[PDB]
Write a structure and sequence with these properties.
The structure is cut from a larger assembly and holds chains A and B. Chain A is 37% helix and 7% strand. Helix content of chain B is 71%, strand content 0%. Classes of the chains: A mainly alpha, B mainly alpha. The interface between A and B is small, with 4 and 4 residues. The complex binds adenosine-5'-triphosphate. Chain B: Belongs to the SNAP-25 family. Chain B: This is Synaptosomal-associated protein 25. Chain B: It is found in: Cytoplasm, Perinuclear region; Cell membrane; Synapse, Synaptosome; Photoreceptor inner segment.
Amino acid sequence: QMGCKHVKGILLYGPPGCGKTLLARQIGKMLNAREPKVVNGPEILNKYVGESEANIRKLFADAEEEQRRLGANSGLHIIIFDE
Amino acid sequence: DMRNELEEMQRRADQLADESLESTRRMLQLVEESKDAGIRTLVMLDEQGEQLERIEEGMDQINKDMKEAEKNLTDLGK
Ligand SMILES: Nc1ncnc2c1ncn2[C@@H]1O[C@H](COP(=O)(O)OP(=O)(O)OP(=O)(O)O)[C@@H](O)[C@H]1O
C-alpha cells in the first residue's frame, strides 16, 4: 500500500580494531537465507583482459536468476565486501 | 621541479582458444564415426575379396570341364 523502496547498501567505518568484521559476520549468522557471499577485495583482479568484470558479475548472477524465477516473493541475498 | 616519471604494468591477451571447444568436440565425434565406418568397410571388402577368390576356382573348373567334354564328343563323333 505504501509502495516504498528498500535500502540496498551499508558502509561501516572506524579506527582499527572495533568490531567491524565481527559485527558483519554476526549479522550474516543472524539472517536465514542463502549463505552470504564474501569477497576479500584484492582477489577480483586478474591478469587476463576482461576477467575482472566476469568475476564481479558472477556475484549478482545468482541473485538475478532467483529474482527472475520467483519474482517479488524471492529471498534476500547478502554480499560482503571486505577492504 | 615538476619532472615526473612512471612505471609500467602488463596484461596478457587471452590465449588462442574459446572457439576450440565447440567445433572441436563435434569434429572429434565425426572423426570417430568415420573411423568406425572405415573399419566396417575394411571388413566387408575383405569378405568380398575372399568370395571372389572362391568364385575363381569354380569358374576355371567349369571352363576346363566343358572344353574337355566338347573335345571328347567331337573326337568320338568323327
Ligand atoms: N565490541 C567488542 N566486543 C568484543 N570483542 C571485540 C569488540 N570489538 C573488537 N573485539 C575483538 O577484537 C578482535 C578483532 O576485532 P575485529 O576483527 O572486528 O577488528 P576490525 O574492526 O575488523 O579491525 P581492522 O580494522 O583491522 O579490520 C576480536 O578478537 C574481537 O573479539
